[PDB]
Amino acid sequence: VIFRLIQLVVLVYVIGWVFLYEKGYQTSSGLISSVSVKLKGLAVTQLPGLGPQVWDVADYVFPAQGDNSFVVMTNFIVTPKQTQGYCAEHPEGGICKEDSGCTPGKAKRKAQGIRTGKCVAFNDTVKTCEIFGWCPVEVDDDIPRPALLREAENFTLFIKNSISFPRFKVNRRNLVEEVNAAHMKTCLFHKTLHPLCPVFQLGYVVQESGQNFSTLAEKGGVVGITIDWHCDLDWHVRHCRPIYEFHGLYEEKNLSPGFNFRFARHFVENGTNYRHLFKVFGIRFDILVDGKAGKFDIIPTMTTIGSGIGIFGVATVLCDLLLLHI
Amino acid sequence: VIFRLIQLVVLVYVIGWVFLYEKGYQTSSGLISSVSVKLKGLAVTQLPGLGPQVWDVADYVFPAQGDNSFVVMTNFIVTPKQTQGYCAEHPEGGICKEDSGCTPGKAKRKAQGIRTGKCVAFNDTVKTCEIFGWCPVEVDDDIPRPALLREAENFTLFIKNSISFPRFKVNRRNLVEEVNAAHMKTCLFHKTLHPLCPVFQLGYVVQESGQNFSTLAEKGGVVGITIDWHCDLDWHVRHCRPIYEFHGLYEEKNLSPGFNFRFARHFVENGTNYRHLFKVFGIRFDILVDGKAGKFDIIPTMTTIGSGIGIFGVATVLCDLLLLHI
Amino acid sequence: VIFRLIQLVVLVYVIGWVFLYEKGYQTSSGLISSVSVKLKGLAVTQLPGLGPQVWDVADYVFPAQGDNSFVVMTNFIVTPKQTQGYCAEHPEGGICKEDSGCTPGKAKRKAQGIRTGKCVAFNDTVKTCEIFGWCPVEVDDDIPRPALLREAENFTLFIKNSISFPRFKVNRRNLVEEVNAAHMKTCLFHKTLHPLCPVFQLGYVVQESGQNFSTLAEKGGVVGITIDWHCDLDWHVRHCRPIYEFHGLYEEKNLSPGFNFRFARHFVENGTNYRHLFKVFGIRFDILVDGKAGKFDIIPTMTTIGSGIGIFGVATVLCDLLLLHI
Numbered sequence: 022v023i024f025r026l027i028q029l030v031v032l033v034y035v036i037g038w039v040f041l042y043e044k045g046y047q048t049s050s051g052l053i054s055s056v057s058v059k060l061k062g063l064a065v066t067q068l069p070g071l072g073p074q075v076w077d078v079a080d081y082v083f084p085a086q087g088d089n090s091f092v093v094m095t096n097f098i099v100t101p102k103q104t105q106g107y108c109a110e111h112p113e114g115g116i117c118k119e120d121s122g123c124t125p126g127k128a129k130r131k132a133q134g135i136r137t138g139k140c141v142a143f144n145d146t147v148k149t150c151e152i153f154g155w156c157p158v159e160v161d162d163d164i165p166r167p168a169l170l171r172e173a174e175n176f177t178l179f180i181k182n183s184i185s186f187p188r189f190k191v192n193r194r195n196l197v198e199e200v201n202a203a204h205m206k207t208c209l210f211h212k213t214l215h216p217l218c219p220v221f222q223l224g225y226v227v228q229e230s231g232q233n234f235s236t237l238a239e240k241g242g243v244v245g246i247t248i249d250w251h252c253d254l255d256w257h258v259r260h261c262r263p264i265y266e267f268h269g270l271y272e273e274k275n276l277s278p279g280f281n282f283r284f285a286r287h288f289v290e291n292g293t294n295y296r297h298l299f300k301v302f303g304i305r306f307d308i309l310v311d312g313k314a315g316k317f318d319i320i321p322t323m324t325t326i327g328s329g330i331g332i333f334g335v336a337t338v339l340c341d342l343l344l345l346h347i
Numbered sequence: 348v349i350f351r352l353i354q355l356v357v358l359v360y361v362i363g364w365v366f367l368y369e370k371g372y373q374t375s376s377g378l379i380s381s382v383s384v385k386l387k388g389l390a391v392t393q394l395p396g397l398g399p400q401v402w403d404v405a406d407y408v409f410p411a412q413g414d415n416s417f418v419v420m421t422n423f424i425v426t427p428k429q430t431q432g433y434c435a436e437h438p439e440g441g442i443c444k445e446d447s448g449c450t451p452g453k454a455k456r457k458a459q460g461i462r463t464g465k466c467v468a469f470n471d472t473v474k475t476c477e478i479f480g481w482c483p484v485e486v487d488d489d490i491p492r493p494a495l496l497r498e499a500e501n502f503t504l505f506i507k508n509s510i511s512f513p514r515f516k517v518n519r520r521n522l523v524e525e526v527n528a529a530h531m532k533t534c535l536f537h538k539t540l541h542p543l544c545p546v547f548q549l550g551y552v553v554q555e556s557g558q559n560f561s562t563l564a565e566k567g568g569v570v571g572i573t574i575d576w577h578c579d580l581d582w583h584v585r586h587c588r589p590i591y592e593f594h595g596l597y598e599e600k601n602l603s604p605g606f607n608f609r610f611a612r613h614f615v616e617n618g619t620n621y622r623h624l625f626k627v628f629g630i631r632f633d634i635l636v637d638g639k640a641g642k643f644d645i646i647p648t649m650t651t652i653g654s655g656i657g658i659f660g661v662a663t664v665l666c667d668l669l670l671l672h673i
Numbered sequence: 674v675i676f677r678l679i680q681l682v683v684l685v686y687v688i689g690w691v692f693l694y695e696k697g698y699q700t701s702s703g704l705i706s707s708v709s710v711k712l713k714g715l716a717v718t719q720l721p722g723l724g725p726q727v728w729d730v731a732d733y734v735f736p737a738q739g740d741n742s743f744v745v746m747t748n749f750i751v752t753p754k755q756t757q758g759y760c761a762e763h764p765e766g767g768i769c770k771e772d773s774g775c776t777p778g779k780a781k782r783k784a785q786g787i788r789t790g791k792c793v794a795f796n797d798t799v800k801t802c803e804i805f806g807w808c809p810v811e812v813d814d815d816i817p818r819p820a821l822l823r824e825a826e827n828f829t830l831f832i833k834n835s836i837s838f839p840r841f842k843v844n845r846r847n848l849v850e851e852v853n854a855a856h857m858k859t860c861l862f863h864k865t866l867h868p869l870c871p872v873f874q875l876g877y878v879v880q881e882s883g884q885n886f887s888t889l890a891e892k893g894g895v896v897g898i899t900i901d902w903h904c905d906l907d908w909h910v911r912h913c914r915p916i917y918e919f920h921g922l923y924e925e926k927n928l929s930p931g932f933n934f935r936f937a938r939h940f941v942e943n944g945t946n947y948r949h950l951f952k953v954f955g956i957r958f959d960i961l962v963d964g965k966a967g968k969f970d971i972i973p974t975m976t977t978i979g980s981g982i983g984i985f986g987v988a989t990v991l992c993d994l995l996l997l998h999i
């Protein structure tokens with residue numbers, strides 16, 4: 022009788038686990054995703070010598086059109102009115118005492134310009150090789166300790182994620198039926214309180230990634246936002262909801278901490294070409310959307326049943342051999 | 348004799364389905380893809396007060412260098428010569444009667460600037476809190492009903508998709524051998540007539556995604572272009588061709604319809620910093636390239652044969668048990 | 674005795690191959706990746722009529738903030754001070770003898786502007802239809818044979834790849850423990866000599882992709898950089914290292930060789946709107962990061978053991994049938 026008992030255990034396993042837990046009766050399809058991101062919020066940076074400068078979405082989001090991976094500027098160093106000319110290079114490229122030390126040409130690594138070959142004063146104490154390039158050279162030694170856009174903590178990120186399961190011809194948007202005009206007006210995403218609001222406060226996103234916004238704001242950082250669409254299309258499509266998880270690890274001990282990049286805003290003034298060089302420290306938000314849809318299909322159902330019978334057949338042989346040797 | 352009959356059925360299944368349909372004799376490798384997109388076409392927008400403005404690829408493609416996900420501008424709202432200053436904020440941030448209602452600071456959500464705390468006239472009828480920020484504030488209430496770049500319907504998208512199967516060291520470009528200089532000159536992609544022309548008319552792409560370009564043009568939209576490379580490398584490499592499928596669902600009832608973003612073109616005029624704010628309504632084309640290559644390999648062939656023998660062994664046991672109990 | 678001999682062979686197979694080589698005792702999880710790219714190096718282009726122009730990271734990287742897919746400019750054609758006006762279109766849009774040939778409107782394909790309908794002289798020998806658009810029209814017929822930014826060969830690409838295995842809560846950066854401040858100062862990645870230095874010389878990357886930088890520099894190109902994280906988390910996390918492989922095939926015979934795009938730098942001079950049109954020929958670097966982590970888990974271990982017993986049970990039946998029929 023114990024022989025058939027195992028058969029029931031195998032039958033329970035197949036039905037309970039393979040046929041039900043793993044949804045063996047369902048076929049699976051990946052998704053194709055499109056992510057639209059809009060940032061709302063504004064930061065003001067009043068440099069002691071420069072009047073209050075405002076930074077809206079058009080100025081602190083890179084790229085402006087948005088992408089799966091986009092950068093929100095949280096701190097910057099600006100070299101205003103850079104012009105192509107001769108000037109002393111940054112001392113990070115070497116410090117010279119006389120023109121003999123400087124060699125005409127271009128530095129082998131991290132070149133700042135075309136070295137003329139004569140030493141010139143970078144400042145009163147330090148003399149550096151004269152280069153041809155964007156002048157004055159960028160001085161990014163002093164990152165602002167309170168991030169100039171630390172107010173980006175309260176910026177709101179609206180993630181509009183349109184997914185499709187092409188095999189099942191099911192289109193879903195992360196703005197699920199629950200999300201309405203009233204929610205989009207005042208809702209801020211919370212992992213438990215508002216798990217479906219597609220408006221994310223950047224500080225909350227960074228905090229839920231296991232990171233500190235104040236630390237990430239100063240020198241930039243990385244936050245990974247995963248949107249998971251695990252949907253059972255055998256149920257009403259309204260249950261096909263996204264799951265948001267935030268990822269990131271900022272170790273100050275780790276070398277090259279944070280994220281930064283340089284971009285320039287070229288302009289012409291007084292019939293001369295100038296540019297504003299910005300070393301933008303910012304949090305790169307990588308929005309990775311993954312998921313699978315499961316819809317009942319007869320072909321996986323039959324193969325799962327066939328696999329269950331095959332498992333049953335193997336188990337009966339194993340029980341037969343077991344009883345013989347024991 | 349029925350015992351061996353089932354054996355043939357299992358043998359037919361293994362050979363016919365596992366060994367041939369599923370190509371069990373082949374090993375499989377994913378692909379690494381690079382997508383190059385070039386947009387050709389031009390739109391002219393003659394505002395009643397502003398002379399005819401032309402929009403070529405450098406101006407309506409975001410990003411200009413292109414990407415797997417890029418935006419073609421189909422409609423825009425422009426705030427010309429925005430300057431950082433004091434002005435009335437947009438009424439969407441609140442309408443005030445007196446300065447008492449306004450509070451100095453920054454709005455908690457969708458902040459437009461630094462509220463000075465005194466109510467000022469946004470226009471004759473409506474007074475809004477004075478803010479410091481980009482002035483005049485954007486008025487995006489009236490989206491142009493005929494899209495300013497509705498001529499983007501006839502824009503041509505050239506998708507240059509270079510894929511590689513690194514395991515098989517096979518490199519393919521969507522410009523297949525069939526595609527030649529004469530085709531690239533006049534061909535427009537059609538799902539059946541010209542299924543290999545890599546030049547796609549945007550209107551056709553939107554139409555084949557199940558969407559209406561006129562609707563998507565006004566408020567933006569999303570079109571997913573999937574390039575599938577299902578190649579059997581046992582055949583000549585010339586048969587490794589891409590398959591293009593277009594995806595998208597635009598529901599006007601759905602909240603936040605379409606896609607839009609704001610970008611600015613900063614410039615200096617009369618020794619003052621200005622910017623042109625554009626609320627760009629556009630169709631975000633997400634080009635997702637997937638696929639797998641199958642090349643004959645002895646190791647999968649042996650395992651498939653071994654699996655077939657294993658299936659044969661299980662089937663014989665099942666037939667044995669069947670005949671006993673029946 | 675040969676019966677049990679096969680049992681050992683199956684036991685060796687399960688333990689040796691399934692349980693050990695394929696790490697059946699381990700569960701597997703994909704990774705979520707964020708790629709930060711910084712380009713260092715400078716190129717100078719001294720046009721015979723235009724003074725030496727320098728190109729630093731802010732000017733030759735598209736997008737400036739970087740992405741998984743980014744473009745490093747290696748050659749460009751510039752149309753300076755384009756303004757919206759009437760002028761002769763490029764002869765690629767058609768050559769006319771009289772105004773009768775030109776038709777007012779817009780060309781059906783590759784439109785350059787709004788044709789006024791009167792033929793005008795493009796140059797002394799050739800007359801083309803007058804259009805309204807960006808003037809003077811781009812003349813990209815003569816790509817510079819020595820690429821203007823062929824010095825991009827010695828540009829250094831710093832790939833900062835932060836990955837996470839969310840199931841295992843393991844965060845890794847391609848700046849592995851071996852990589853320190855001293856390495857990041859002077860190291861250049863080599864496939865064998867320095868396989869962990871995250872600073873890549875562009876010439877080396879193109880060369881290791883099977884391509885010639887001089888060829889790719891002139892007309893652009895594509896290089897795929899794959900970062901593979903195949904990590905066994907049963908071992909210390911310091912062994913979770915990335916593997917870099919470079920992919921690309923440049924066939925001059927292939928149609929549409931290379932990669933190029935057009936972007937504009939709009940500016941206002943003398944109270945008039947102008948733009949600098951750049952046809953940027955560049956190498957698009959697609960950084961695809963993939964990999965899987967394997968950590969010992971009891972559930973895969975039991976199923977692998979159960980599968981091994983199942984394989985053992987099937988093998989015993991096959992040996993039984995074999996001995997009967999033979």
Ligand SMILES: Nc1ncnc2c1ncn2[C@@H]1O[C@H](COP(=O)(O)OP(=O)(O)OP(=O)(O)O)[C@@H](O)[C@H]1O
Nearest residue numbers: 130131161277278281711712713829830831857872
């Ligand atoms: N592409 C590159 N080639 C060579 N060195 C690089 C490159 N990118 C960064 N580095 C160097 O690596 C170190 C850390 O890089 P990281 O970008 O995090 O620092 P940083 O202080 O912002 O650098 P920098 O101001 O030099 O761009 C610095 O010494 C930086 O100069």
Ligand SMILES: Nc1ncnc2c1ncn2[C@@H]1O[C@H](COP(=O)(O)OP(=O)(O)OP(=O)(O)O)[C@@H](O)[C@H]1O
Nearest residue numbers: 059060061177178179205220456457487603604607
């Ligand atoms: N990041 C965000 N934070 C908060 N609200 C947002 C955000 N992005 C969009 N919204 C709001 O969500 C609603 C719909 O968003 P959507 O971007 O589709 O509309 P819109 O009319 O283009 O918005 P807007 O002009 O305010 O950017 C609007 O009320 C908009 O203000």
Ligand SMILES: Nc1ncnc2c1ncn2[C@@H]1O[C@H](COP(=O)(O)OP(=O)(O)OP(=O)(O)O)[C@@H](O)[C@H]1O
Nearest residue numbers: 385386387503504505531546782783813929930933
């Ligand atoms: N979107 C498009 N629609 C139509 N033709 C296109 C498109 N993109 C490129 N082409 C044409 O395809 C051919 C090769 O394309 P490719 O971009 O490699 O060449 P090109 O010389 O840089 O082109 P162009 O200067 O015309 O942009 C050219 O004749 C080009 O005009």
Ligand SMILES: *[C@@H]1O[C@H](CO)[C@@H](O)[C@H](O)[C@H]1NC(C)=O
Nearest residue numbers: 112113143144145146147162
């Ligand atoms: C001069 O420059 C060096 C290197 O950047 C810096 O350490 C030093 O403090 C500077 N001195 C002054 C007086 O600014």
Ligand SMILES: *[C@@H]1O[C@H](CO)[C@@H](O)[C@H](O)[C@H]1NC(C)=O
Nearest residue numbers: 171172173174175224454455
């Ligand atoms: C964000 O939270 C509130 C705004 O409602 C404010 O009190 C706080 O200071 C803000 N923090 C920053 C860093 O701007």
Ligand SMILES: *[C@@H]1O[C@H](CO)[C@@H](O)[C@H](O)[C@H]1NC(C)=O
Nearest residue numbers: 228232233234235236237239
């Ligand atoms: C973040 O860092 C700041 C300063 O480094 C510190 O005051 C604060 O307690 C940290 N944590 C949070 C949650 O802000």
Ligand SMILES: *[C@@H]1O[C@H](CO)[C@@H](O)[C@H](O)[C@H]1NC(C)=O
Nearest residue numbers: 438439469470471472473488
């Ligand atoms: C004033 O602004 C409000 C809010 O934008 C608008 O509804 C109204 O039509 C405007 N009135 C005039 C006369 O422009």
Ligand SMILES: *[C@@H]1O[C@H](CO)[C@@H](O)[C@H](O)[C@H]1NC(C)=O
Nearest residue numbers: 497498499500501550780781
């Ligand atoms: C696109 O098709 C033709 C151009 O050949 C033209 O008749 C039609 O009006 C165009 N449509 C738009 C919206 O520009």
Ligand SMILES: *[C@@H]1O[C@H](CO)[C@@H](O)[C@H](O)[C@H]1NC(C)=O
Nearest residue numbers: 554558559560561562563565
């Ligand atoms: C698209 O919409 C327009 C106006 O909304 C309508 O006239 C047209 O019939 C629709 N369909 C197509 C295919 O253009």
Ligand SMILES: *[C@@H]1O[C@H](CO)[C@@H](O)[C@H](O)[C@H]1NC(C)=O
Nearest residue numbers: 764765795796797798799814
């Ligand atoms: C005139 O333009 C045509 C077409 O671009 C070109 O082939 C020819 O060489 C040009 N002639 C001169 C004198 O520039």
Ligand SMILES: *[C@@H]1O[C@H](CO)[C@@H](O)[C@H](O)[C@H]1NC(C)=O
Nearest residue numbers: 128129823824825826827876
């Ligand atoms: C790159 O290599 C060295 C620089 O160290 C130089 O001799 C060589 O000419 C450079 N090549 C180019 C194309 O700039």
Ligand SMILES: *[C@@H]1O[C@H](CO)[C@@H](O)[C@H](O)[C@H]1NC(C)=O
Nearest residue numbers: 880884885886887888889891
């Ligand atoms: C690359 O091309 C140039 C010119 O086309 C040639 O001189 C050189 O030998 C080629 N190979 C390498 C490795 O530079």
Ligand SMILES: [Mg+2]
Nearest residue numbers: 113160161162
């Ligand atoms: Mg620095």
Ligand SMILES: [Mg+2]
Nearest residue numbers: 439486487488
């Ligand atoms: Mg609005």
Ligand SMILES: [Mg+2]
Nearest residue numbers: 765812813814
């Ligand atoms: Mg051309």
